[PDB]
Amino acid sequence: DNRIKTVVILGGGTAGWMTAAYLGKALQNTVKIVVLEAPTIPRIGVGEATVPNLQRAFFDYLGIPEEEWMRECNASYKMAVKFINWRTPGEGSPDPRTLDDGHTDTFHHPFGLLPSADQIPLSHYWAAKRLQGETDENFDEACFADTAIMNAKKAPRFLDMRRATNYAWHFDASKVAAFLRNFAVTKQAVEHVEDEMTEVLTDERGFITALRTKSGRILQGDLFVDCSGFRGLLINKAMEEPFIDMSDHLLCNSAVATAVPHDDEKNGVEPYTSSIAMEAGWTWKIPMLGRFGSGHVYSDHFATQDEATLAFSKLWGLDPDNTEFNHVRFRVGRNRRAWVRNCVSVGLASCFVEPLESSGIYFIYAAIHMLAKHFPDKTFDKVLVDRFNREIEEMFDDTRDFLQAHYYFSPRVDTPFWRANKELKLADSIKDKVETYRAGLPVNLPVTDEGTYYGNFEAEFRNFWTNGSYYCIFAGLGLMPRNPLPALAYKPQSIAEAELLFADVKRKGDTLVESLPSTYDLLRQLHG
């Protein structure tokens, strides 16, 4: 019997308890699972956003109904991230400015896959009309019925819970962690050790054999998961694996955040996350029931902590001297290798980007999903470890490049921060994708229906940022192809076929805006 017998997870939070809960199910109680979590003072919940696969790939895998965990974490609904004022110059404001053509400086990044006509996505039929002056609708409103629903703040489900569109979730991360802790301990025989780690003991081959606790207890294990956050107490300190700083791709490195009370009955609840551009970064708005979390992501090379806190306070009209703020300084990049010997890093201990596109929880699940697939025995095959590392670094580098495109193609040049983003270098892969986009060709064309895409995680993992997403960001920022897809000039029947698709997007949005309940009303029914 050369199997792993004990897995020790260092650190709690979402990363530690998602790992414990998932491995408890995946290893079918053949392995003892221990979580060593230092007790900490509970901070205010600033909000976390997710992607649609979380319910199908994670909670359904654990047998946890969607409504059950939503009620224990004050969860809300998310249909997109909404970018505000990323093209017009000026101070930070929650109200969108006006573009040169009179349109409001907002664009959406919704979920789902675009329909096709003659194997060509709807985005390309829109671009042909837009480039020729035959339409004045923006991409998101022409190709997504979700845009009309979000503008009316309607819910993604009816009152009888029939689905209307794809959606993800907003929640308090600390309440989700507490929920999974109770689940894993009572229903999955996970042992919770409330103590601090003081020393990491390694053998002659450099493998971790045990952790010492502050109380003197020794925790022996065979496989160790580092969920200790940015400190990387196992992967970086003990294993000495270098962290690859990637600040030459993304300049932001700091954040100030808080939670703001919100009158839901008066103003309603927005079924989306807002990305509000600032002078030295941007500010998120993650609405929940009764309050929304908000945080200003900024670069300390272009704004001091006080400057960022004042601009953040002025955004929501807060008293900086009588408001509870949280200040964070984070590292941007990834470890050279996520898995070294018998130490697997998950979450912030592995890699991190600014939450511009809700990568945090997704990065955690994708790692624990790949860990179960590549789970070793006590021999720790180098090929298993290498293939795991390969999937993690490709996943991260791909999303990193996607985020850099947000800053590089923003037309703003009014402050040194926005000017400095144009001096950074694009990765070769994102340069290649832009070149393809500018020719009128699709980028990362979806090959599956939405059922396969969101029902099988491996299908989405091989194509996370699809053609629709690149059009949302590129066209949203004003970057258009040089010309329409040249094949469309020979396909008049296909162009007419897509006109029916455009009419369906208008028809679906208008019908649903009438019949769907408000997000506020669905939340009251859910949390009632």
Place this chain on the structure above:
Amino acid sequence: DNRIKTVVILGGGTAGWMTAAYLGKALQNTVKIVVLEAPTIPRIGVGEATVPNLQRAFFDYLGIPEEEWMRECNASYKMAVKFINWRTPGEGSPDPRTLDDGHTDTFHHPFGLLPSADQIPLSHYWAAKRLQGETDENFDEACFADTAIMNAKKAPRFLDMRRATNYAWHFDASKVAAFLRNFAVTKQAVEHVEDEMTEVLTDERGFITALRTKSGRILQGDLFVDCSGFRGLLINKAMEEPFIDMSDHLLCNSAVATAVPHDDEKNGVEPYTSSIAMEAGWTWKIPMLGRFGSGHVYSDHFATQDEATLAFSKLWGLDPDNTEFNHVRFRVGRNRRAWVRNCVSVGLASCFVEPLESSGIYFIYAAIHMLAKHFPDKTFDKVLVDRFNREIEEMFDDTRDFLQAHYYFSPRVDTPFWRANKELKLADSIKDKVETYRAGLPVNLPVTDEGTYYGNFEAEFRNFWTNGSYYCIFAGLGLMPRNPLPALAYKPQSIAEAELLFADVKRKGDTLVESLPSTYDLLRQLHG
């Protein structure tokens, strides 16, 4: 109007008339299409095999029912390629020898995608049982119900044409070309010019402006498709694009072929292609109604034309002095670029490998599919051409490496030909896949169901050789993983779940072997 107005296709055959027919539909009669086809003396039909996507991706796209074109080409059914005597030394024989461990020296490479249990393919559950001595079944019979159906020579459809399994087609290529020629000329307004080309006329930049015919007529065009075969009259001769010879991966370069009358009533008809290993190569067997096509692929560095012809005749008991033979000398490799300026190469003019895995028609369709997707205007955007060439060279190199693995991992070393294959080196990409396979991990894991896979060509093109195919060849030739997938040691419930999957494969095979008609009986009904 900067559009292409006229497309001139040099050469007929399957490549020329698949291009003409397909572009006739894709360009929606906005472009005049001309085929310049030299009249040639009809050779005996040696047989061609295909892949399952041909009906959905090509004939259904043209609106041609399956039974209609099958009846005009004496088409038969193909459920796999069956490799015979690729693991044992000796003279060429149609009868399989016996391995040292008692197994018969045959293995199949069927179509379809393997089921999975706990997101793990059935191949990995088979490998675990085989490596632990808990089963003696071969991979193909344990994971494919088609293997039992093929062993009984049953048809892939019932007599009322209800589908029973996946399948492809055997046919006469010249009759398919004649069928498509008649379709394109009568139903699609394609102009057929029966003449030889004498001159290629170019402008100052090297773009083709017209072709002159032997009769003196000049055919002007804007885009030219080279379907002239191995000579590459446009892409290689006129445009001077170099051909990348890849004989350092595949040694075969010649073929002798014929058609053999067959007593279908006595012996039945095999619903598969046979690859019969020889002393200096291999021989195909493509059964049709009343006859089978056969061809000995060999290397002339290890067998003269007479030596190969005698061994080929001895295989089927033919009189070499009273038999009609076709002799061909082919090049193995691809052009440096498939599309140069306004010249697109399709078929043998573009690239070629031996038909060990039915690459011919698939290579043609993939090129014409990608040409319609990247179809240009008269400016010929460099990015369109580059993306097309990128898809062609990756498609080819991937199949090239897959074919070399057949020879590289064959345990035969008995003749100078088989020993010479062991001196070649594997490409880095296939070395990586072997390393992954040997650790027990899946290689090119399928992420879609069979409906999406065979219904959307882009899904299959991004994953043509899936995990099932690599197991068919590696395990069929005796290359096994070093150990089972380590995660299986922690998943006893998943092992039990796959045991039900194995039971379903047995149940389907046994039930269908009883109720299905013979392939001979379905063909008699189809061609009646």
